[PDB]
Amino acid sequence: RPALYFCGSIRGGREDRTLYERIVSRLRRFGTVLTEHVAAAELGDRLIHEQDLEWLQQADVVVAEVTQPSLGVGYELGRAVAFNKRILCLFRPQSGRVLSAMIRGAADGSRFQVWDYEEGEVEALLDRYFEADPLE
């Protein structure tokens, strides 16, 4: 099965955890979600970084929920771009916040895309994304 790497804020703040839960659940339909407890309710920094970096290199796609600002999510995206990974970022404008110019500016609109969305449609958007370019 293909491998997916999901990114979402933890020490940046866990406001969106229930949404991360939904996203991870839907991503699993398309392959193994290596990071499936960015979403765990009850949540060796070197060991964490090394295991995550192993996972990131094996991933066939990186999906990041980037509404909550987070050093770790940004770092994962930076490493992912340097690995030239396929990357999808998901951002919610209804938060009132404006997304980092660095993340929106890193997008090229094909291999690295940033999609604005509202919470209710996120499963349908993931379905759309992977039907247009399947992971094999």
The annotation places the binding site for 5-hydroxymethyl-dUMP at: 8, 10-12, 70, 72, 76, 100
How far is the C-alpha of 89 from the C-alpha of 92, rounded, in Å?
10
Q: Does 14 bind a second copy (CB under 8 A)?
A: no
Tell me the closest approach of the beta carbon of residue 94 to ligand N6P, in angstroms.
19
Q: Tokens 């930076």 identify what position?
A: 78
How far is the C-alpha of 7 from the C-alpha of 72, rounded, in Å?
8
Tell me the closest approach of the beta carbon of residue 114 to ligand N6P, in angstroms.
13
Q: Does 46 bind ligand N6P (CB under 6 A)?
A: no
By the 8 A CB rule, do 2 and 60 touch? yes
Q: Does 11 bind a second copy (CB under 8 A)?
A: yes
Which helix (H) or strand (E) is 3 found in, with range? strand 3-7
How far is the CA of 56 from the CAs of 16, 51, 88, 105, 115, in angstroms?
22, 9, 14, 21, 21
Q: Which does 8 bind (CB under 5 to 8 A by kind): a second copy, Ca ion, ligand N6P, none?
A: ligand N6P
Number of residues that bind ligand N6P (CB under 6 A): 20
Pick between residue 91 and residue 130 the one whose CB is nearest to Ca ion: 130
Provide the binding-site residues for Ca ion, judged by CB under 5 A.
Answer: 133-134
